[PDB]
């Protein structure tokens, strides 16, 4: 196992979620819930106390930083902006998703423009898919032609994390399995 994922100094962006693998090693999913104070450990399929006893190459860790109000979207069957346009879990999702607040790290006076999220897309994301397209999203009957205006929007919006914002408008950080 490794801890440089959760204790990473730089996290990913939602639309460009960063995946990490772990194999030919041993993973202890119990003591993970010790360096914790985790505000979320939503879990579908089997309890981590029981899953501590087997392991393929299934060991995957997806890291990124979302919006507070949006943490509920990293869940099977949910819709919205992140689920349809950034990170879609399957319906066969067997794993866990861990989250915690991080406003003292990913927030700035004047907003933090490093973390972005996809806001438009021609079709919903198939499960476990990563789309880094930056093309002007055609909203109406008009080919845009590399120019923004009414309709034809830039698809990636910035979170602009300020500390004065509410807890829903606050940063976070997610995991996978």
């Amino acid at each position, epitope marked *: 196992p490794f801890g440089e994922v959760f204790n990473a100094t730089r996290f990913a962006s939602v639309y460009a979620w960063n995946r990490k693998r772990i194999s030919n090693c041993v993973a202890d999913y119990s003591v993970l819930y010790n360096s914790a104070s985790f505000s979320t450990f939503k879990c579908y399929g089997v309890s981590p106390t029981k899953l501590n006893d087997l392991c393929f190459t299934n060991v995957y860790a997806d890291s990124f930083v979302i919006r507070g109000d949006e943490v509920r979207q990293i869940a099977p069957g949910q819709t919205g902006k992140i689920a349809d346009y950034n990170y879609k879990l399957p319906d066969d999702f067997t794993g866990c998703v861990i989250a915690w607040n991080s406003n003292n790290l990913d927030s700035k006076v004047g907003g933090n423009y490093n973390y972005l999220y996809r806001l438009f897309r021609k079709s919903n994301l198939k499960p476990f898919e990563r789309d880094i397209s930056t093309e002007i999203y055609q*909203a*109406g*009957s008009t080919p845009c032609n590399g120019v923004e*205006g*009414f309709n034809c929007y830039f698809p990636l919006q910035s979170y602009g994390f300020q500390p004065t*914002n509410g807890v829903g408008y606050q940063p976070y950080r997610v995991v996978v399995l």
Partner: antibody
Framework: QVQLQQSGAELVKPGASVKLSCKAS????????IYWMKQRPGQGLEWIGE????????NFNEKFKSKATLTVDKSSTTAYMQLSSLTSEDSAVYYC??????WGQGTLVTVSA | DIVLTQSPASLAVSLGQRATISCRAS??????????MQWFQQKPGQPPRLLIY???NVDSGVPARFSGSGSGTDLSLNIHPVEEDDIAMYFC?????????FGGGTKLEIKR
């Protein structure tokens, strides 16, 4: 910052033509389509005719007779609209806008002898 | 030419309250998953600024106090904590069919 400096506050004799300028700053001139809007006190906002700072433009049949939109891609980074044969229904405030953010200050044209 | 009819034409609300204005369109301003509506705000003596684009998305520099809702033919602009600087005219504008059309407006004045 993103700025749309319009000229204007212009007296135009009835029946003549006028050319309103709008200089853009703080953003790349070619990535953002530019729209021109008409507002007369009493009436609401009216019509969005656009120029794509790269040839193409599109107007409204209501203005497809008195409105001619052009632009200087060069160091001007300035969008121009020419109004032709100005009647008293043409005196108003005209805005250039970027589809996002604040509009230009607005040029007030007054058609009087 | 879709006709945009705003209601009410004049709304008075108190500091901190919620203000809601609505915009009816003769036709549906929806297209292939997006509602092509925009909300503009013109303070007294200022040029209009874009508040809302694509019916429900907020533009940069606009506080979260403004929200956009509705569907296809009937749209709504909401202000959850009305602050003292919101005194302005509010225009709805459509963009599914050229010509782009505007609404009549809505003067928002504040009770004190």
């Amino acid at each position: 910052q993103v700025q749309l400096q319009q000229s204007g506050a212009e007296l135009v004799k009835p029946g003549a033509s006028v050319k309103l300028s709008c200089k853009a700053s703080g953003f790349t001139f070619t990535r953002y389509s530019i729209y021109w809007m008409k507002q007369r006190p009493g009436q609401g906002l009216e019509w969005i005719g656009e120029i794509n700072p790269s040839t193409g433009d599109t107007n409204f049949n209501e203005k497809f007779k008195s409105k001619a939109t052009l632009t200087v891609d060069k160091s001007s980074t300035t969008a121009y609209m020419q109004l032709s044969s100005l009647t008293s229904e043409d005196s108003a405030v005209y805005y250039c806008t970027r589809s996002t953010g604040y509009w230009g200050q607005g040029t007030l044209v007054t058609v009087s002898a | 030419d879709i006709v945009l009819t705003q209601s009410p034409a004049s709304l008075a609300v108190s500091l901190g309250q919620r203000a809601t204005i609505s915009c009816r369109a003769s036709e549906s301003v929806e297209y292939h998953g997006t509602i092509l509506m925009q909300w503009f705000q013109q303070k007294p003596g200022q040029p209009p600024r874009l508040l809302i684009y694509a019916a429900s998305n907020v533009d940069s520099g606009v506080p979260a106090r403004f929200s956009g809702s509705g569907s296809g033919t009937d749209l709504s602009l909401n202000i959850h904590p009305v602050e003292e600087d919101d005194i302005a005219m509010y225009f709805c504008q459509q963009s599914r069919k050229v010509p782009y059309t505007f609404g009549g407006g809505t003067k928002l004045e504040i009770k004190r």
